[PDB]
Design a protein around this ligand. Structure first.
Ligand SMILES: [Cl-]
Ligand SMILES: [Cl-]
Ligand SMILES: [Cl-]
Length: 163
């Protein structure tokens, strides 16, 4: 584990991360997809061999020795707010189990269900709070990746408020 486990946020492409493993915002079918998923497919295509997994779960596939944890958040266009909230919390709990099993000291993670699976709603606080609920009991350094300048400021404020 990290000596003083922390949370950080960076505004840049997660495919350029400086962590020991990455979480992909995957689709259930293991397809190249869009957004984060397409960037992950271009950087670590080998990790999409048998990466299909249900909504609410995470499945890790190695690219060489680098782990790619495919975490499938719900598409809020298809799920109700209640059931989607439950599946989003579940996907993050599965990411925490995989990060612990892998023994990594750091992990790069995007906010699940905040892009094309958001159903057109701003889900920064919802998704980030479920990330904290799952990752707080782990001792890996967590680095959250985002692309919007206002989201970077809001995620940074939420991290600092708890310290
Ligand atoms: Cl970039
Ligand atoms: Cl998304
Ligand atoms: Cl963003």
């Amino acid at each position: 584990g990290a000596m003083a486990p922390s949370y950080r946020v960076k505004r840049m492409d997660i495919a350029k991360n400086d962590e020991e493993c990455v979480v992909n915002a995957a689709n259930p079918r293991g397809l190249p997809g869009d957004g984060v998923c397409k960037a992950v497919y271009k950087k670590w295509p080998e990790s999409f061999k048998n990466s299909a997994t249900p909504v609410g779960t995470a499945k890790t596939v190695m690219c060489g020795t680098y782990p790619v944890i495919h975490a499938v958040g719900p598409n809020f266009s298809n799920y109700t707010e209640s059931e989607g909230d439950r599946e989003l919390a579940a996907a993050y709990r599965e990411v925490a189990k995989e990060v612990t099993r892998l023994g990594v000291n750091s992990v790069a993670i995007p906010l699940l269900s905040t892009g094309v699976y958001s159903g057109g709603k701003d889900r920064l606080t919802q998704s980030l709070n479920h990330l904290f609920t799952a990752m707080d009991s782990t001792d890996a350094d967590v680095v959250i990746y985002c692309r919007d300048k206002e989201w970077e400021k809001k995620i940074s404020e939420a991290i600092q408020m708890r310290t």
